Design an enzyme around this catalytic site. Structure first.
Site, short mmCIF file in Angstrom:
data_model
loop_
_atom_site.label_atom_id
_atom_site.label_comp_id
_atom_site.label_asym_id
_atom_site.label_seq_id
_atom_site.Cartn_x
_atom_site.Cartn_y
_atom_site.Cartn_z
N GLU A 64 0.67 -7.53 5.73
CA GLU A 64 -0.40 -7.03 4.85
C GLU A 64 -1.62 -6.35 5.55
O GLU A 64 -2.46 -5.74 4.87
CB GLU A 64 -0.92 -8.18 4.02
CG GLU A 64 0.05 -8.66 2.96
CD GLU A 64 0.03 -7.77 1.75
OE1 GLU A 64 -0.94 -6.98 1.59
OE2 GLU A 64 0.98 -7.86 0.94
N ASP B 61 -6.71 0.80 -0.53
CA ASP B 61 -5.29 0.65 -0.20
C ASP B 61 -4.54 1.97 -0.41
O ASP B 61 -5.16 3.01 -0.65
CB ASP B 61 -4.67 -0.52 -0.96
CG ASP B 61 -4.45 -0.23 -2.46
OD1 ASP B 61 -4.66 0.91 -2.95
OD2 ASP B 61 -4.05 -1.19 -3.15
C1 NAG Z 1 -0.44 -1.69 11.57
O1 NAG Z 1 -0.30 -0.51 12.34
C2 NAG Z 1 0.74 -0.64 13.28
C3 NAG Z 1 0.78 0.60 14.16
O2 NAG Z 1 1.02 1.75 13.38
C4 NAG Z 1 2.07 -0.83 12.54
O3 NAG Z 1 3.08 -1.09 13.46
C5 NAG Z 1 2.01 -2.05 11.63
O4 NAG Z 1 3.12 -2.05 10.78
C6 NAG Z 1 0.80 -1.93 10.74
N1 NAG Z 1 0.71 -3.05 9.84
C7 NAG Z 1 0.60 -2.92 8.51
C8 NAG Z 1 0.49 -4.16 7.67
O5 NAG Z 1 0.55 -1.85 7.92
#
Ligand code: NAG
Ligand SMILES: *[C@@H]1O[C@H](CO)[C@@H](O)[C@H](O)[C@H]1NC(=O)CCCCCCC(C)C
Ligand code: MAN
Lengths: 7, 166
Positions: free
Chosen positions: B11, B20
């Site tokens: 999340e 969001d």
């Molecule tokens: C946060 O950003 C990282 C790098 O892009 C990604 O791997 C990860 O899935 C992201 N987390 C969410 C909850 O979007």
């Protein structure tokens, strides 16, 4: 920093 | 690890209000504040939830409290739903976590719509359920999360969970 994400 | 760390992986985390993907004001671990277009509306909801003038910024403990409330609401949603409750009841704790994750993301009504996948899970047909879940709109639109959730249904293990902010 201090905020979160991920962007 | 457990439902809490799982949803943390899936999340994200914000200590300041953000929009969001649907354009809605959100904070914490996926806590929706309002669907109104107004940032001031979002701040009044937040101020009401937290009991102080936050100016859009919360502490980690406050994020954590909202998160535990929202997890508890996801479980209440499952338990109130005549399609979800018997599936949930029958599942081991790891697979229960996977179901809670889905409800957290899309709501009870959404998850309850996976009629065939739910029957397959009820029948411990894990591979079929995983195959069937991957056919969905959900999987196509949020595949990173859906893959991990699906692996958890398939295996009953935490294996799928084992920059760009800060
Ligand atoms: C946060 O950003 C990282 C790098 O892009 C990604 O791997 C990860 O899935 C992201 N987390 C969410 C909850 O979007
Ligand atoms: C934040 O992401 C960084 C970059 O990936 C990591 O190096 C860093 O360890 C991460 N921090 C944390 O996860 C700790 C923050 C505590 C947040 C807990 C609040 C929630 C609501 C339980
Ligand atoms: C990462 O970057 C975006 C800038 O687009 C900000 O909105 C966010 O607060 C963070 O700084």
């Amino acid at each position: 920093x201090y905020x979160x994400x991920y962007x | 690890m457990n439902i809490f760390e799982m949803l943390r992986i899936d999340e994200g985390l914000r200590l300041k209000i953000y929009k969001d993907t649907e354009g809605y004001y959100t904070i914490g671990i996926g806590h929706l504040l309002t669907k109104s277009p107004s940032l001031n509306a979002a701040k009044s909801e937040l101020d009401k939830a937290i009991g102080r003038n936050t100016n859009g910024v919360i502490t980690k403990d406050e994020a954590e409290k909202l998160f535990n409330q929202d997890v508890d609401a996801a479980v209440r949603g499952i338990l109130r739903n005549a399609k979800l409750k018997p599936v949930y009841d029958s599942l081991d704790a790891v697979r229960r976590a996977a179901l809670i994750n889905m409800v957290f993301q899309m709501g009870e009504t959404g998850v309850a719509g996976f009629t065939n996948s739910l029957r397959m899970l009820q029948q411990k047909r894990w591979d079929e359920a995983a195959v069937n879940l991957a056919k969905s709109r959900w999987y196509n639109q949020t595949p990173n999360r859906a893959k991990r959730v699906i692996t958890t249904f398939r295996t009953g293990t935490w294996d799928a969970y084992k920059x760009a902010x800060x």
